[PDB]
């Protein structure tokens, strides 16, 4: 048998599914989701890490001249200075008073811990979803991992299940993201080769093992002070450290729907949004024939007490008569109230008790015990506790039944007004007719 159903995507919310085939007893499936993982497809475009400045010892030439050629190194800066008189601990370095030259050079290269400490940037795309679902029915109770994409068919207990696709295409990650250790940020980044000094992206590299590098840090050289040997250089500090100082607000403390964001791989979990369509192909061995199943006649329902809350604070009693004891399937035909137990223990005594949860002032719903059907209406009282630590265990509905007290008041007020209007229109009609007859 092929059947279809829609399940709300809330972690921990139980779901009841009813299957009815003529000639066989109805079956109820208990389905639940335990964890949902949403992962997008990423394509790395570059990474960034703190840098270092390599400056070799200066070249001092006495009684001569020097001239440095350009090399292919990132931000290589070289210069030659004339008229220098270097000094050391012993004494003067050269006889030549004013015919000395000094060649200075420096460049920038990635730090030795770039491999271990770095921040990568990524571009987002379409995102696939994976979930884990617990299914129980009869003697079968098992959890399976599924790909919610409309493709992954799972065989449990000789039964085929297909899931998805999701009804809403919503992802919390924006087009451009930045990942650092355990944090993700939805901040944009400058393109490759267009970085600016003092900010993010001063040092650029395609990958961690890449031999090429793009650098822009405004390395400037200066003339050495007289009577000393040194190289003076000015440079804007690393942008990576500044960004780490003022990265902003992380996505982990900002994502809507209470999604838990974790890295390696970059993904979000427990995103409560939308609903999943499910389709199942069931074998015939899992059901029960009618003539083995008890026959219920003259089913009447009543409500013991009702207090709408996130708990199961509502109990009702069901009355019946059978021909033999056994096990039956119990279900509720509306989302206004949700039952707790799927299988009912039927016996010759003729009385059973059930629990349920609801969120309406006056709920009315149709209950089914095996093949028999009855109606239940109730009046509930609001709870006294304000804050609870557990999530709600009912569908959010607040609209009262047509037979509730407030709607009854509306009804008789409207009926009285309508009766008055009908009397008035009848009087006007008869008056105008007797007038027109003249």
């Amino acid at each position: 048998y092929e059947h279809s159903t829609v399940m709300p995507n809330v972690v921990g919310f139980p779901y009841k599914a009813h299957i009815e085939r003529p000639g066989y007893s109805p079956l109820t499936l208990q389905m639940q989701v335990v964890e949902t993982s949403l992962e997008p497809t990423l394509n790395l475009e570059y990474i960034t890490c703190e840098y270092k400045t390599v400056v070799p010892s200066p070249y001092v030439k006495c009684c001569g001249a020097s001239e440095c050629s350009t090399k292919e190194k990132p931000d290589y800066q070289c210069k030659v200075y004339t008229g220098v008189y270097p000094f050391m601990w012993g004494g003067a370095y050269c006889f030549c008073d004013s015919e000395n030259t000094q060649l200075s050079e420096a460049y920038v290269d990635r730090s030795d811990v770039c491999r271990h400490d770095h921040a990568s940037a990524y571009k987002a795309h379409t995102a696939s979803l994976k979930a884990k679902v617990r299914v129980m029915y009869g003697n079968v109770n098992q959890t399976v991992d599924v790909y919610v994409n409309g493709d992954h068919a799972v065989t449990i207990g000789g039964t085929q299940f297909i899931f998805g696709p999701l009804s809403s295409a919503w992802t919390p990650f924006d087009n451009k993201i930045v990942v650092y250790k355990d944090e993700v940020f939805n901040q944009d980044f400058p393109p490759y080769g267009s970085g600016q000094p003092g900010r993010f992206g001063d040092i650029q590299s395609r990958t961690v093992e890449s031999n090429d590098l793009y650098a822009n840090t405004a390395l400037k050289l200066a003339r050495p002070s007289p009577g000393m040997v040194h190289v003076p250089y000015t440079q804007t500090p690393s942008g990576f450290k500044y960004w780490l100082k003022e990265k902003g607000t992380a996505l982990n403390t900002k994502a809507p729907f209470g999604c838990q964001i974790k890295t390696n791989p970059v993904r979000a979990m427990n995103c409560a949004v939308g609903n999943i369509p499910v389709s199942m192909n069931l074998p015939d061995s899992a059901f029960t024939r009618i003539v083995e199943a008890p026959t219920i006649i003259d089913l009447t329902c009543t409500v013991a007490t009702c207090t709408h809350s996130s708990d199961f604070g509502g109990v009702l009693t069901l009355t019946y008569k059978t021909d033999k004891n056994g096990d039956c399937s119990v279900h509720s035909h509306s989302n206004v109230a949700t039952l707790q137990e799927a299988t009912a223990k039927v016996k010759t005594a003729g009385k059973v008790t059930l629990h349920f949860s609801t969120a309406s002032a006056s709920p009315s719903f149709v209950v089914s015990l095996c093949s028999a059907r009855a109606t239940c209406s109730a009046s509930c009282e609001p709870p006294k506790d304000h804050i609870v630590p557990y999530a709600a265990s009912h569908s959010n509905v607040v609209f009262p039944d047509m037979s509730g007290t407030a709607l009854s008041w509306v009804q008789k007020i409207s009926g009285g007004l309508g009766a008055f209007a009908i009397g008035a229109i009848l009087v006007l009609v008869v008056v105008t007719c007797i007038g027109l007859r003249r």
Binding site: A421, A424, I425, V427, L428, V431, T432, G435
Partner: protein, 52 residues
Amino acid sequence: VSAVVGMSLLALISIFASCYMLVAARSKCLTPYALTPGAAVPWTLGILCCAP
């Protein structure tokens, strides 16, 4: 608050319309006797509808 105000306006307009239409019906029923020279309305119609 929106539901309460809407229901109140609906009830008010209903009762006002019914009353105005009843008054108009009475006026249209009792108009011809005022136009007839002489004569007078019967006391039955003068009791059922307030006749000057």
